[PDB]
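re: that complex we talked abt at group meeting.

here r the seqs, copy pasted straight from the sheet so there may be weird spacing, ignore it
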Amino acid sequence: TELFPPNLTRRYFLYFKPLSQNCARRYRISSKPLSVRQIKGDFLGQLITVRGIITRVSDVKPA
Amino acid sequence: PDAVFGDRVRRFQEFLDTFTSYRDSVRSIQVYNSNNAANYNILPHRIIISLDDLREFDR
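got the structure back, here u go
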């Protein structure tokens, strides 16, 4: 007897989406478009957005 | 430790006068960094010890 590990029956994913609207100017940041240059500090293990230019597109492979 | 720790502690009472002029400095640099971070709507921990405060009276 072995129960299902929870990863078997999902057939779905999760996603997230931050904010940079006047709700940040309502009352209180985590979604200012910081560049790549100033990012090496305590920003490791967080949620940060960065703008850029996408290069080196690989293909789609099954994991 | 008593031999390798004793002149630590005797210095631990000694250098506190060698930041009479910096014990203001080390807290003034953070109190606004604590302030602005609470009202956003930034400096590292630099404690410049000069020679002069450690050569005039400790040999």
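couple things i noticed - The two ends of chain A are 28 Å apart (CA to CA). Chain A has no helices and no strands.
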